[PDB]
Amino acid sequence: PPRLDGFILTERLGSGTYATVYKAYAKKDTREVVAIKCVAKKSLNKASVENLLTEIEILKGIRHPHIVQLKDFQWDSDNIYLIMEFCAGGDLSRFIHTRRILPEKVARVFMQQLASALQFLHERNISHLDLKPQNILLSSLEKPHLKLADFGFAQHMSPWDEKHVLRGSPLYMAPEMVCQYDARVDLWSMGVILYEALFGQPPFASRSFSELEEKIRSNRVIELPLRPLLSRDCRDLLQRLLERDPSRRISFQDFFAHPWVDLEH
Numbered sequence: 001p002p003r004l005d006g007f008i009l010t011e012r013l014g015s016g017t018y019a020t021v022y023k024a025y026a027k028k029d030t031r032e033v034v035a036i037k038c039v040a041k042k043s044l045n046k047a048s049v050e051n052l053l054t055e056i057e058i059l060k061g062i063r064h065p066h067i068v069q070l071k072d073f074q075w076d077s078d079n080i081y082l083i084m085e086f087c088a089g090g091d092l093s094r095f096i097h098t099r100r101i102l103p104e105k106v107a108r109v110f111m112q113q114l115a116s117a118l119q120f121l122h123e124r125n126i127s128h129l130d131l132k133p134q135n136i137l138l139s140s141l142e143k144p145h146l147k148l149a150d151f152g153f154a155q156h157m158s159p160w161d162e163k164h165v166l167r168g169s170p171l172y173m174a175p176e177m178v179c180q181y182d183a184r185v186d187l188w189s190m191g192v193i194l195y196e197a198l199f200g201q202p203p204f205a206s207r208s209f210s211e212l213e214e215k216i217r218s219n220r221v222i223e224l225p226l227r228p229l230l231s232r233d234c235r236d237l238l239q240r241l242l243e244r245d246p247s248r249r250i251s252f253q254d255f256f257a258h259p260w261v262d263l264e265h
């Protein structure tokens, strides 16, 4: 791994074609623990100092209990270092899948954590995410707080081959997205995540890509499986997140004031 002025790099947590994320203990503090994303400068489309630091200022100001904090930004001769809040529970995708499903009560707590993050971000006109359980992390396994993460560093630290890099998971992408579309795609995504939490797999889970495409392009309303049976409110919310016509899909205003979501926790 890389040696850094302020931290000791322990386990590998993540790997990309270009980046690597290590866990880290602060040197002279040790109880202080971070996740550090490392990216070689050679992999990046070079950028203004103005523009990059401007973007880092903006990311560091995106501070919410259910968003992974960018704590600091460092660099050396070879790399950049995005120093993040460490989430010790791992990703929401393992969490669901190793438990098969989450019961409605737990799903609910999680959705209100994720919605409170999304409302905050919506207020700031931040949107068009790649929301999925793999980019959502857990503060711990003990009574976990979910944390939205950005697994794809972008904008002024984008790579040279940005126009040849494929973006989105299609199991979480709003169909209008995969085929002109506003931030209401994020509400679709929330729907997929809720559905995956209650039923164990995204609505469009599939053996193959043609199978997947079929489902994305279909006009069938999404059928909720029979079990578990869920409260009338949960089912209302979920049906209205998973509406294909974005015009017909729930508003952000309605999502945030929706009874099942509370937002009077």
Ligand SMILES: N#CCNC(=O)c1ccc(-c2ccnc(Nc3ccc(N4CCOCC4)cc3)n2)cc1
Pocket: 013, 014, 015, 016, 018, 019, 020, 021, 035, 037, 068, 084, 085, 086, 087, 088, 089, 090, 091, 137, 149, 150, 151, 152
């Ligand atoms: N390169 C690349 C692609 N990955 C990321 O961008 C990425 C990965 C991890 C984190 C991150 C941030 C904060 N905390 C953590 N915690 C974390 C803890 C455990 C695990 N896993 C434990 C189980 O095995 C898989 C790793 C993953 C993340 N990760 C942020 C971005």
